[PDB]
């Protein structure tokens, strides 16, 4: 399907391209409703 694998360094632009959003708070889930 691909036939090769390439490895290199990641630019900040590349890292922003992978992401779907920025994590701003250190919270995980609500302690009462258990929702994200």
């Amino acid at each position: 399907e691909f036939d090769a694998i390439k490895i290199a360094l990641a630019s900040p632009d590349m890292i922003r391209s992978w992401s779907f959003g920025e994590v701003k708070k250190p919270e995980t889930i609500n302690y009462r409703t258990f929702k994200p």
């Binding site: 250190p26 919270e27 995980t28 889930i29 302690y31």
Partner: protein, 513 residues
């Protein structure tokens, strides 16, 4: 040298002991040991403490403690600073107009009277006096005597004390106005100097002294110099900037040089305040570290506690006055403790618990300890509720808090270094037999639905989203089939009845249960 001997010994023997390496040589020792193992080459052979806390201690050490009087001077310095900026901003005209408009809006019941102002150096009477002074001064801008009138207006304005929030708002408004003026000036300078190599001497001779009319730029275009000729191409943007400057001059009502001098004095005062505050905090870092050693094992690392304590100190030093006489080490410890406790209650556990619930848990723990010591055996939820004044359901709910999550790598196998995370199953995956059952059900439905008139099959596929993109209602399928929501229901019922009796639908019965 010393490392060379150890390396020679290791090469000769191929291995070394801890004692030999340590003698021939905490974090520095670990780093050296790691470097030595590099060979088992050139870089390691050729090759402070790295602890973030030791470096912090070192950088803090180069400080001098302050004695009782050592603060007083600093304190007065701060006051001077702030006083200066007050006198720097007392001259700003639009500030008093904004204050009056806000006061009128407050009088329109849009906000509490007291929230607007923290008193003065009675509120309605002082506001009336301020309004009278403003009306008598604004309508006397005529130059010769207007300066004294404005000075008296500002002097009476000095008697007032303003809330920090709105005073900072006025300061920021003045800053943004000055920033707009400076941005326009910088655009003019870039479009006139870089684009035309306009000498600075001409700018000083013309721009400075008036800074209002267009004579400094428009009339200089005929100076018989290459820069004047080149300014023709960029004359449009410079003219627009000059128009904006002339409009702004109306708002300022003052010479721009005076504004620059006022801003310079404000900056000097702000720097003085800043240097005084830095000198105060540098001394108090020792107090901050001394306080923040009672919260070691609480979920936060020592350095985080120290940094939170440093925030509280910087807040106190800004809210400390020497009128009361509290030795800083009494007005400051409170803020440090508050900040550290709140930070521990905000960022110490992964599943965050509010502050009030943390206090409830701590109180319950203290009561449980007291009860355990007193009665001897243990307190039960009923006894806890009785001793703690709660409905005995809140107690159970608080006890049911999820504690602290277990590390998923906790070695639990004890036989092959297995981790707790290897034994947790995925409960959302669909069993392979259920997928096959779903496919078989789809096939059976496709087979059965082909055993009735095409209209019935179409209607059933339209109502139930069988292979369709989406479900549909009666009226939509009626639009499809040019009938109105009644014959469609009848045909659907007929088809369901037809499929109802056996000999036509028996494998479906097998799927049912």
């Amino acid at each position: 040298s010393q490392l060379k001997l150890l390396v020679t010994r290791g090469k000769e023997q191929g291995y070394l002991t801890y004692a030999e390496v340590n003698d021939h040589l905490d974090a520095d020792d670990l780093m050296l040991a790691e470097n030595t193992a590099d060979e088992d080459a050139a870089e390691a052979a050729a090759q402070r403490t790295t602890d973030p806390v030791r470096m912090y201690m070192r950088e803090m050490g180069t400080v001098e403690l302050l004695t009782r009087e050592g603060e007083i001077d600093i304190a007065k310095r701060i006051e001077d600073g702030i006083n200066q900026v007050q006198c720097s901003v007392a001259e700003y005209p639009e500030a008093i107009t904004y204050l009056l408009e806000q006061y009128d809006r407050v009088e329109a019941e849009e906000a509490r009277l007291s929230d607007l102002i923290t008193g003065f150096v009675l509120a309605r009477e002082k506001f009336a006096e301020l309004r009278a002074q403003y009306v008598v001064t604004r309508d006397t801008i005529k130059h010769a005597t207007a300066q004294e009138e404005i000075l008296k207006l500002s002097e009476v304005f000095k008697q007032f004390r303003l809330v920090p929030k709105q005073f900072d708002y006025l300061v920021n408004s003045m800053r943004v106005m000055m920033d707009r003026v400076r941005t326009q000036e910088r655009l003019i300078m870039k479009l006139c100097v870089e684009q035309c190599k306009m000498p600075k001497k001409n700018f000083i001779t013309l721009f400075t002294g008036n800074e209002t009319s267009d004579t400094w730029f428009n009339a200089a275009i005929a100076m018989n110099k290459p820069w004047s000729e080149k300014l023709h191409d960029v004359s449009e943007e410079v003219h627009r900037a000059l128009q904006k400057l002339q409009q702004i001059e109306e708002e300022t009502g003052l010479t721009i040089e005076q504004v620059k001098d006022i801003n310079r004095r404000m900056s000097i005062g702000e720097a003085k305040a800043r240097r005084a505050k830095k000198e105060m905090v540098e001394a108090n870092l020792r107090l901050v570290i001394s306080i923040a050693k009672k919260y070691t094992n609480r979920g936060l690392q020592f350095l985080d506690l120290i940094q939170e304590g440093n925030i509280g100190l910087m807040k106190a030093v800004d809210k400390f006055e020497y009128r009361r006489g509290y030795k800083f080490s009494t007005y400051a410890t409170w803020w440090i403790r508050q900040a550290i406790t709140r930070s521990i209650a905000d960022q110490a556990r992964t599943i965050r618990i509010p502050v009030h619930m943390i206090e409830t848990i701590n109180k319950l723990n203290r009561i449980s300890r007291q009860m355990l010591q007193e009665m001897g055996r243990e307190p039960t939820p009923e006894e806890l509720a009785e001793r703690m004044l709660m409905p005995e359901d809140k107690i159970r709910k608080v006890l049911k808090i999820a504690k602290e999550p277990i590390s998923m790598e906790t070695p639990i196998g004890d036989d092959e270094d297995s981790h707790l995370g290897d034994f947790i199953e995925d409960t959302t995956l669909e069993l392979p037999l259920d997928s096959a059952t779903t496919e078989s059900l789809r096939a059976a439905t496709h087979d059965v639905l082909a055993g009735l008139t095409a209209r019935e099959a179409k209607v059933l596929r339209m109502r139930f989203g069988i292979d369709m993109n989406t479900d549909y209602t009666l009226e939509e399928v009626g639009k499809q089939f040019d009938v109105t929501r009644e014959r469609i229901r009848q045909i659907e019922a007929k088809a369901l009845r037809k499929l109802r009796h056996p000999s036509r639908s028996e494998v479906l019965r097998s799927f049912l249960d």
